[PDB]
Amino acid sequence: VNKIAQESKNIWKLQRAITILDTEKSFLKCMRKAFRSGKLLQVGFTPDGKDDYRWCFRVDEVNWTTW
Amino acid sequence: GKIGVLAYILQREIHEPECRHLSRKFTEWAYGPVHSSLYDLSCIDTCEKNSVLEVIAYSSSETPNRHDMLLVEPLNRLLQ
Amino acid sequence: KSLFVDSYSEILFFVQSLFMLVSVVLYFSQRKEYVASMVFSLAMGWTNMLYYTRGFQQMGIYAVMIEKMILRDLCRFMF
Amino acid sequence: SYTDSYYKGQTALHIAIERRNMTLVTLLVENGADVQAAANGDFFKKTKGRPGFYFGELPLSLAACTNQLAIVKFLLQNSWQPADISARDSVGNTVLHALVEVADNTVDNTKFVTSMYNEILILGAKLHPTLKLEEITNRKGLTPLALAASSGKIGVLAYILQREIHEPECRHLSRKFTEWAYGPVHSSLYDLSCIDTCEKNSVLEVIAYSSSETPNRHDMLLVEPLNRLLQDKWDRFVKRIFYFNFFVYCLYMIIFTAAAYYRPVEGLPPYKLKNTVGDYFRVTGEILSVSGGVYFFFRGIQYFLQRRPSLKSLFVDSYSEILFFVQSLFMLVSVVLYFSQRKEYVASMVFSLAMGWTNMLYYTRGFQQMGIYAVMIEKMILRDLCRFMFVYLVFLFGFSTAVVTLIEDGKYNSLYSTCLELFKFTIGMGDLEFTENYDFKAVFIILLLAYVILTYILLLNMLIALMGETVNKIAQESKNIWKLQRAITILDTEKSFLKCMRKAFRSGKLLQVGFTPDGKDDYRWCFRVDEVNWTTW
Amino acid sequence: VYLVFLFGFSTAVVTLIEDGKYNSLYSTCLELFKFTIGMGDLEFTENYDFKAVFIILLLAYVILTYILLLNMLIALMGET
Numbered sequence A: 001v002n003k004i005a006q007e008s009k010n011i012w013k014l015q016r017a018i019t020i021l022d023t024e025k026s027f028l029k030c031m032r033k034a035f036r037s038g039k040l041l042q043v044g045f046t047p048d049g050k051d052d053y054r055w056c057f058r059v060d061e062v063n064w065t066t067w
Numbered sequence B: 001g002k003i004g005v006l007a008y009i010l011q012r013e014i015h016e017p018e019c020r021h022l023s024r025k026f027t028e029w030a031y032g033p034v035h036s037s038l039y040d041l042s043c044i045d046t047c048e049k050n051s052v053l054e055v056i057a058y059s060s061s062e063t064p065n066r067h068d069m070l071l072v073e074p075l076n077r078l079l080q
Numbered sequence C: 001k002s003l004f005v006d007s008y009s010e011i012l013f014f015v016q017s018l019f020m021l022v023s024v025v026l027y028f029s030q031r032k033e034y035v036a037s038m039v040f041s042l043a044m045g046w047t048n049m050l051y052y053t054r055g056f057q058q059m060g061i062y063a064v065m066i067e068k069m070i071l072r073d074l075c076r077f078m079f
Numbered sequence D: 001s002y003t004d005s006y007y008k009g010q011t012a013l014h015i016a017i018e019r020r021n022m023t024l025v026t027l028l029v030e031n032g033a034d035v036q037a038a039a040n041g042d043f044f045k046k047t048k049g050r051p052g053f054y055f056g057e058l059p060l061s062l063a064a065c066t067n068q069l070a071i072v073k074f075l076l077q078n079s080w081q082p083a084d085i086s087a088r089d090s091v092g093n094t095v096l097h098a099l100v101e102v103a104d105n106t107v108d109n110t111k112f113v114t115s116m117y118n119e120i121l122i123l124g125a126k127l128h129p130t131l132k133l134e135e136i137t138n139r140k141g142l143t144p145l146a147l148a149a150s151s152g153k154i155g156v157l158a159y160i161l162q163r164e165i166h167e168p169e170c171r172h173l174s175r176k177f178t179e180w181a182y183g184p185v186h187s188s189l190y191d192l193s194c195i196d197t198c199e200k201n202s203v204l205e206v207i208a209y210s211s212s213e214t215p216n217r218h219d220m221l222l223v224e225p226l227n228r229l230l231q232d233k234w235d236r237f238v239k240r241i242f243y244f245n246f247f248v249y250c251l252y253m254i255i256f257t258a259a260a261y262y263r264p265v266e267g268l269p270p271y272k273l274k275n276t277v278g279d280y281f282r283v284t285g286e287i288l289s290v291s292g293g294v295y296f297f298f299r300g301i302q303y304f305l306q307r308r309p310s311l312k313s314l315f316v317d318s319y320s321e322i323l324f325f326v327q328s329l330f331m332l333v334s335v336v337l338y339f340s341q342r343k344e345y346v347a348s349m350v351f352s353l354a355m356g357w358t359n360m361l362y363y364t365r366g367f368q369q370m371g372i373y374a375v376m377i378e379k380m381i382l383r384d385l386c387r388f389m390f391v392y393l394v395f396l397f398g399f400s401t402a403v404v405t406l407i408e409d410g411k412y413n414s415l416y417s418t419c420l421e422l423f424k425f426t427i428g429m430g431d432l433e434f435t436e437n438y439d440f441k442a443v444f445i446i447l448l449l450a451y452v453i454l455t456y457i458l459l460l461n462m463l464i465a466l467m468g469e470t471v472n473k474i475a476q477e478s479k480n481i482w483k484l485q486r487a488i489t490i491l492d493t494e495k496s497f498l499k500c501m502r503k504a505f506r507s508g509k510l511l512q513v514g515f516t517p518d519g520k521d522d523y524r525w526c527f528r529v530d531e532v533n534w535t536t537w
Numbered sequence E: 001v002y003l004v005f006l007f008g009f010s011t012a013v014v015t016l017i018e019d020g021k022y023n024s025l026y027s028t029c030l031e032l033f034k035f036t037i038g039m040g041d042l043e044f045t046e047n048y049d050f051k052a053v054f055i056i057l058l059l060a061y062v063i064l065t066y067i068l069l070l071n072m073l074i075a076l077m078g079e080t
């Protein structure tokens, strides 16, 4: 037990992810709301003039340096 | 299980003309110390066959870093 | 080998289901051994409740450590 | 400025300050920009469920929170429109309240927030010597010190409580003062205004009665002036009273124990009092026991009313009060059953009696080693025993159901007896051949051996290993929690005090500086601490 | 700590027992002590009413002392 603490935390997260994937794959109701994060425009400037919507996921972060 | 390469890719951000589109991490706004980044998530959440989550989660148990790969910021937050 | 070293939980659930089905076959086979299978399934079923400890940060780690202990320390000690 | 509710009040000056553009800030101020304009949109509030950045809503607080000292100095000391350093937002927060808010106890954050705090304090003194910024309270009534104490911003307290300013005409802002220094030894003086006692928000009260959600409520008492002050209060005033209370409780439990032990065995209470000495003492002890139960009952209600725990704080914390209250509840139920002519008053009474004796461990606080031992027992019960007991009960129940299913028309043949009989294995008393009323001996013995291996061999040794891991990690946490329990005991004692005693107020009305901004002298109730250092001769 | 627990539960149990073989602080104290050495009978008497109260008290005592306190002692000795 002294040697499998962190390994245990990673395993916990891992098989919880397994649970998530099985839930969304089975889903028993033809539900599309499982596809999250919203269709956002990242750059709007592809190599051509078109705009790219790429289903981004938002993460807000705070830093006290590199102002 | 090449965790380093994923660590590079999943948060790739390129600041120059004609190469921003290659970025998978984009900075939307940054007010003071706070700022909101956007992770691309193509082929992470879902795709035709090899979604990254499917590949990691259904690994063969011999992949070196299968416990570690889901610690990479976008994946852990997405799973939560 | 990947059939056994991982997916411990799926194997246990499958074995529970096997014991249930064998209990059924013996039940309609007019054999009183159906009890023997049935109780095993029942026992297995309650134990497999620990599968659902996962999704709890505190209990799931405990269950994971049970799995690791069974694979390494208990097996060596029992030998 | 913006008119939408999301960015309401944002103006150009906020942008120039926020972007760290000195030139535009200067130009906008020159053109009459309002340095008091309040950015009070949703984005500029705490607003946990949405993105935002709370900074006190004012330009000065913005420059302060952004580590722009030059802009702060300009905003206060520009020609066109100097800023009001005492200005307050919609919450009532000043700049200093904002600086407390933005703190997060990380190293660089603490460093710069502390530096900016010191700078703004100096500027406030020089611009307005009669103005005392720290005394200003927000709509929550909290001074920046009180806010820092409540919010767990340990770094800010670590600065403030031992703040010392080495320059002329700012000495009176210091809270730490060095009276004499002979060789390596010198005697410092800590102020402790509004730490020991004040109108409402004494720092010790704020920390001790915290809501359990403050991050560093355990760590904050380690800051030297508080720890020494509590130790002095203990030694001088509270140690004796606490020992006396413990003695009284021991007497109470002994009386209760004796009264219960000599209960009569006749049916149908209440019982006629016999005219003999033994029964007179018996009924006396009964009455005293009931009286004490009522006392604890009302203390529990008083606690609940005074703190008003919100139905999670009622259970996640303050276990001692709940346990004592539950004991008193059992006592009262015993009384009701007794006079209701129900023999079940015995059943309640023993429970109360049992809990009473275990609640004796509450008094292990005040003794260094024993209180720590009690805290570790509390943590063990809450974490490891709970997890283990859940899993063990799953195993026990599963195998009990399997075996009792296998058993047919035997003596046991029932869930209660089988559960008990399997449980006997855990205490080293399992028979392993307790019945033969079955078919399939092999199945039965396999089930028992599987249960024994899984529970007795694997699980118990696993529990021991996990407890061993746990104690390895909770040592310093135990130290902090014991010190906190001592602190709350001290505060309760001094607050109750039952005698209008003022001697609880320590440290002596000493003169710190004698030179206020005016010619008056300052007496500040300082607490003396002597320290020796063999460097910086 | 163990003696406080032992004494408290001994007092509770001997109060609960009435006109029994044990019915006395000494015998009940020894009888509860026997649990610590893995010899607790757990059904040593029926001279009471309210069987549920009796068994609940014994179970609480066992859990608090035998399961928790002894294993805690082992852990602390490990640290020491």
Ligand SMILES: C=C(C)[C@]12C[C@@H](C)[C@@]34O[C@](Cc5ccccc5)(O[C@@H]1[C@@H]3C=C(COC(=O)Cc1ccc(O)c(OC)c1)C[C@]1(O)C(=O)C(C)=C[C@@H]41)O2
Pocket (backbone or CB within 6 Å): C008, C009, C010, C011, C012, C013, C015, C040, C043, C044, C047, C048, C049, C050, C051, C063, C064, C066, C067, D449, D450, D453, D454
């Ligand atoms: C490892 C295999 C698949 C195993 C399957 C069955 C037969 C099992 O016996 C064992 C052999 C055994 C027998 C006796 C003592 C220890 C081990 O252990 C497990 C297996 C041993 C267990 C272990 O229970 C657990 O694993 C809890 C658990 C932990 C983690 C999980 O992810 C989980 O998913 C369900 C379950 C319980 C039994 O199924 C059970 O309750 C009965 C009656 C026998 C146990 O075979």
Ligand SMILES: CCCCCCCCCCCCC(=O)O[C@@H](COC(=O)CCC)COP(=O)(O)O[C@H]1[C@H](O)[C@@H](O)[C@@H](O)[C@@H](O)[C@@H]1O
Pocket (backbone or CB within 6 Å): D212, D317, D318, D319, D320, D321, D323, D354, D355, D358, D359, D361, D362, D374, D378, D379, D381, D382, D481, D484, D485, D488, E060
């Ligand atoms: C039938 C018989 C059953 C007896 C059941 C009970 C036996 C244990 C009795 C042991 C007595 C220990 C005690 O007297 O108190 C223990 C309570 O034990 C439990 O955990 C009960 C588990 C339910 C700690 O209580 P405390 O008031 O100190 O709570 C702390 C705060 O005060 C502190 O400021 C901190 O916020 C800290 O986070 C809090 O913990």
